[PDB]
């Protein structure tokens, strides 16, 4: 029952106007109910990132594990935020 | 290779049965997926996501497929049941 809801929710999950940190927390919370393997989860996680994070990621060699990709994207966000100020 | 994998992960997510046949959709899906490293649960869920609504609705009256081939076979039989002369 949880798995069905999770597969729907994760596909709709977006960073959108919000932060990588909140997106990543919600993503891992939902993904714990999924039986997708790590490559599929990485691709879904990337799909939901905001355009500006995806643009920054395109300049970099992207981590090939989900936890490392989350760390990479959080760092990108933190850097852009510190630059804004 | 990594490049084929990147292409595959974008193409599989945009692939849709639309107004076309289950067999054409399924052959295209499996062709793309040969270059992916997603496990069978993730492929099942993506395949379902791309089906036409009229096939998806009829799936609810059937046993839940536990393999990609089983789901494809169900959809082929549903299509044959619904097809106009």
mmCIF file of C-alpha atoms in Angstrom:
data_model
loop_
_atom_site.group_PDB
_atom_site.id
_atom_site.type_symbol
_atom_site.label_atom_id
_atom_site.label_comp_id
_atom_site.label_asym_id
_atom_site.label_seq_id
_atom_site.Cartn_x
_atom_site.Cartn_y
_atom_site.Cartn_z
ATOM 1 C CA UNK A 1 0.000 0.000 0.000
ATOM 2 C CA UNK A 2 2.847 2.362 0.876
ATOM 3 C CA UNK A 3 4.688 1.339 -2.281
ATOM 4 C CA UNK A 4 1.846 2.300 -4.571
ATOM 5 C CA UNK A 5 1.494 5.739 -2.980
ATOM 6 C CA UNK A 6 5.279 6.198 -3.083
ATOM 7 C CA UNK A 7 5.580 5.392 -6.782
ATOM 8 C CA UNK A 8 2.916 8.030 -7.542
ATOM 9 C CA UNK A 9 4.371 10.650 -5.171
ATOM 10 C CA UNK A 10 8.027 10.352 -6.131
ATOM 11 C CA UNK A 11 7.202 10.941 -9.796
ATOM 12 C CA UNK A 12 5.356 14.103 -8.858
ATOM 13 C CA UNK A 13 8.018 15.318 -6.385
ATOM 14 C CA UNK A 14 9.788 18.472 -7.540
ATOM 15 C CA UNK A 15 12.260 20.887 -6.024
ATOM 16 C CA UNK A 16 10.416 23.637 -7.883
ATOM 17 C CA UNK A 17 10.694 26.992 -6.152
ATOM 18 C CA UNK A 18 12.150 25.434 -3.022
ATOM 19 C CA UNK A 19 15.472 24.176 -1.740
ATOM 20 C CA UNK A 20 17.580 21.155 -2.624
ATOM 21 C CA UNK A 21 17.662 20.248 1.076
ATOM 22 C CA UNK A 22 13.888 19.955 1.470
ATOM 23 C CA UNK A 23 13.594 18.158 -1.874
ATOM 24 C CA UNK A 24 16.248 15.625 -0.830
ATOM 25 C CA UNK A 25 14.657 14.970 2.571
ATOM 26 C CA UNK A 26 11.220 14.426 1.030
ATOM 27 C CA UNK A 27 12.781 12.276 -1.700
ATOM 28 C CA UNK A 28 14.550 9.893 0.672
ATOM 29 C CA UNK A 29 11.481 9.686 2.895
ATOM 30 C CA UNK A 30 9.360 8.627 -0.085
ATOM 31 C CA UNK A 31 12.012 6.356 -1.584
ATOM 32 C CA UNK A 32 12.275 4.194 1.525
ATOM 33 C CA UNK A 33 8.908 2.725 0.412
ATOM 34 C CA UNK A 34 10.122 1.905 -3.119
ATOM 35 C CA UNK A 35 11.816 -1.201 -4.500
ATOM 36 C CA UNK A 36 13.557 0.722 -7.291
ATOM 37 C CA UNK A 37 17.306 0.208 -7.469
ATOM 38 C CA UNK A 38 19.806 3.022 -6.981
ATOM 39 C CA UNK A 39 20.278 3.885 -10.692
ATOM 40 C CA UNK A 40 16.523 4.416 -11.091
ATOM 41 C CA UNK A 41 16.392 6.476 -7.894
ATOM 42 C CA UNK A 42 19.337 8.627 -9.035
ATOM 43 C CA UNK A 43 17.640 9.319 -12.362
ATOM 44 C CA UNK A 44 14.325 10.205 -10.689
ATOM 45 C CA UNK A 45 16.134 12.457 -8.202
ATOM 46 C CA UNK A 46 17.887 14.277 -11.024
ATOM 47 C CA UNK A 47 14.605 14.614 -12.953
ATOM 48 C CA UNK A 48 13.007 16.577 -10.123
ATOM 49 C CA UNK A 49 15.810 19.048 -9.483
ATOM 50 C CA UNK A 50 15.236 22.671 -10.370
ATOM 51 C CA UNK A 51 16.602 23.928 -13.667
ATOM 52 C CA UNK A 52 19.304 26.063 -12.044
ATOM 53 C CA UNK A 53 20.696 23.133 -10.049
ATOM 54 C CA UNK A 54 20.592 20.916 -13.146
ATOM 55 C CA UNK A 55 22.461 23.594 -15.093
ATOM 56 C CA UNK A 56 25.183 23.784 -12.447
ATOM 57 C CA UNK A 57 25.378 19.977 -12.277
ATOM 58 C CA UNK A 58 25.884 19.774 -16.054
ATOM 59 C CA UNK A 59 29.290 21.471 -15.603
ATOM 60 C CA UNK A 60 30.458 18.770 -13.162
ATOM 61 C CA UNK A 61 31.132 15.063 -13.203
ATOM 62 C CA UNK A 62 28.000 13.810 -11.476
ATOM 63 C CA UNK A 63 28.255 11.436 -8.521
ATOM 64 C CA UNK A 64 27.069 7.899 -9.272
ATOM 65 C CA UNK A 65 25.463 7.136 -5.912
ATOM 66 C CA UNK A 66 22.333 8.793 -4.547
ATOM 67 C CA UNK A 67 23.761 9.934 -1.211
ATOM 68 C CA UNK A 68 26.777 11.461 -2.946
ATOM 69 C CA UNK A 69 24.573 13.147 -5.566
ATOM 70 C CA UNK A 70 22.482 14.666 -2.776
ATOM 71 C CA UNK A 71 25.676 15.929 -1.135
ATOM 72 C CA UNK A 72 26.832 17.406 -4.451
ATOM 73 C CA UNK A 73 23.541 19.208 -5.102
ATOM 74 C CA UNK A 74 23.288 20.522 -1.539
ATOM 75 C CA UNK A 75 26.777 21.952 -1.901
ATOM 76 C CA UNK A 76 25.850 23.607 -5.200
ATOM 77 C CA UNK A 77 22.841 25.205 -3.511
ATOM 78 C CA UNK A 78 24.824 26.371 -0.470
ATOM 79 C CA UNK A 79 27.419 27.956 -2.739
ATOM 80 C CA UNK A 80 24.818 29.790 -4.818
ATOM 81 C CA UNK A 81 23.149 31.014 -1.610
ATOM 82 C CA UNK A 82 26.388 32.316 -0.097
ATOM 83 C CA UNK A 83 27.068 34.016 -3.437
ATOM 84 C CA UNK A 84 23.645 35.690 -3.355
ATOM 85 C CA UNK A 85 24.742 37.389 -0.110
ATOM 86 C CA UNK B 1 28.353 2.717 -21.878
ATOM 87 C CA UNK B 2 27.625 5.879 -19.871
ATOM 88 C CA UNK B 3 26.548 7.907 -22.911
ATOM 89 C CA UNK B 4 23.997 5.349 -24.103
ATOM 90 C CA UNK B 5 22.735 5.175 -20.504
ATOM 91 C CA UNK B 6 22.175 8.950 -20.355
ATOM 92 C CA UNK B 7 20.300 8.898 -23.661
ATOM 93 C CA UNK B 8 18.233 5.913 -22.543
ATOM 94 C CA UNK B 9 17.207 7.428 -19.232
ATOM 95 C CA UNK B 10 15.889 10.534 -20.990
ATOM 96 C CA UNK B 11 14.152 8.664 -23.828
ATOM 97 C CA UNK B 12 12.450 6.038 -21.640
ATOM 98 C CA UNK B 13 10.906 8.772 -19.513
ATOM 99 C CA UNK B 14 9.437 10.521 -22.548
ATOM 100 C CA UNK B 15 8.185 7.372 -24.317
ATOM 101 C CA UNK B 16 4.387 7.121 -24.570
ATOM 102 C CA UNK B 17 1.989 4.619 -26.092
ATOM 103 C CA UNK B 18 -0.346 7.474 -27.013
ATOM 104 C CA UNK B 19 -2.684 6.497 -29.820
ATOM 105 C CA UNK B 20 -0.407 3.681 -30.926
ATOM 106 C CA UNK B 21 -0.306 -0.038 -30.287
ATOM 107 C CA UNK B 22 0.848 -1.882 -27.187
ATOM 108 C CA UNK B 23 3.272 -3.930 -29.251
ATOM 109 C CA UNK B 24 5.017 -0.898 -30.783
ATOM 110 C CA UNK B 25 5.207 0.828 -27.403
ATOM 111 C CA UNK B 26 6.529 -2.330 -25.737
ATOM 112 C CA UNK B 27 9.183 -3.021 -28.387
ATOM 113 C CA UNK B 28 10.386 0.590 -28.232
ATOM 114 C CA UNK B 29 10.395 0.465 -24.421
ATOM 115 C CA UNK B 30 12.494 -2.704 -24.331
ATOM 116 C CA UNK B 31 14.873 -1.389 -27.005
ATOM 117 C CA UNK B 32 15.557 1.706 -24.922
ATOM 118 C CA UNK B 33 15.742 -0.254 -21.680
ATOM 119 C CA UNK B 34 18.479 -2.532 -23.048
ATOM 120 C CA UNK B 35 20.795 0.458 -22.429
ATOM 121 C CA UNK B 36 19.481 1.149 -18.913
ATOM 122 C CA UNK B 37 20.571 -0.256 -15.554
ATOM 123 C CA UNK B 38 17.185 0.144 -13.872
ATOM 124 C CA UNK B 39 15.845 -2.934 -12.123
ATOM 125 C CA UNK B 40 12.629 -4.633 -13.092
ATOM 126 C CA UNK B 41 10.388 -2.837 -10.553
ATOM 127 C CA UNK B 42 11.466 0.584 -11.876
ATOM 128 C CA UNK B 43 10.942 -0.577 -15.461
ATOM 129 C CA UNK B 44 7.489 -1.951 -14.623
ATOM 130 C CA UNK B 45 6.477 1.361 -13.081
ATOM 131 C CA UNK B 46 7.833 3.410 -15.997
ATOM 132 C CA UNK B 47 6.146 1.127 -18.538
ATOM 133 C CA UNK B 48 2.846 1.567 -16.708
ATOM 134 C CA UNK B 49 3.334 5.334 -16.581
ATOM 135 C CA UNK B 50 3.603 5.512 -20.349
ATOM 136 C CA UNK B 51 0.543 3.416 -21.204
ATOM 137 C CA UNK B 52 -2.611 4.884 -22.689
ATOM 138 C CA UNK B 53 -5.308 5.590 -20.103
ATOM 139 C CA UNK B 54 -7.685 3.039 -21.635
ATOM 140 C CA UNK B 55 -5.170 0.228 -21.087
ATOM 141 C CA UNK B 56 -4.238 1.414 -17.602
ATOM 142 C CA UNK B 57 -7.877 1.470 -16.465
ATOM 143 C CA UNK B 58 -8.438 -2.138 -17.515
ATOM 144 C CA UNK B 59 -5.337 -3.280 -15.670
ATOM 145 C CA UNK B 60 -7.154 -2.806 -12.341
ATOM 146 C CA UNK B 61 -9.378 -5.836 -13.024
ATOM 147 C CA UNK B 62 -6.350 -8.105 -13.401
ATOM 148 C CA UNK B 63 -3.793 -9.591 -11.058
ATOM 149 C CA UNK B 64 -0.848 -7.295 -10.389
ATOM 150 C CA UNK B 65 1.952 -8.156 -12.800
ATOM 151 C CA UNK B 66 5.191 -9.093 -11.056
ATOM 152 C CA UNK B 67 7.398 -9.046 -14.159
ATOM 153 C CA UNK B 68 7.732 -6.709 -17.117
ATOM 154 C CA UNK B 69 6.852 -9.521 -19.535
ATOM 155 C CA UNK B 70 3.720 -10.312 -17.549
ATOM 156 C CA UNK B 71 2.589 -6.682 -17.664
ATOM 157 C CA UNK B 72 3.273 -6.493 -21.410
ATOM 158 C CA UNK B 73 1.252 -9.663 -21.965
ATOM 159 C CA UNK B 74 -1.651 -8.287 -19.966
ATOM 160 C CA UNK B 75 -1.622 -5.072 -21.992
ATOM 161 C CA UNK B 76 -1.498 -6.968 -25.293
ATOM 162 C CA UNK B 77 -4.527 -9.010 -24.268
ATOM 163 C CA UNK B 78 -6.396 -5.937 -23.032
ATOM 164 C CA UNK B 79 -5.750 -4.160 -26.334
ATOM 165 C CA UNK B 80 -6.977 -7.185 -28.295
ATOM 166 C CA UNK B 81 -10.127 -7.249 -26.145
ATOM 167 C CA UNK B 82 -10.891 -3.568 -26.757
ATOM 168 C CA UNK B 83 -9.903 -3.213 -30.408
ATOM 169 C CA UNK B 84 -12.588 -1.976 -32.809
ATOM 170 C CA UNK B 85 -13.177 -3.745 -36.126
#
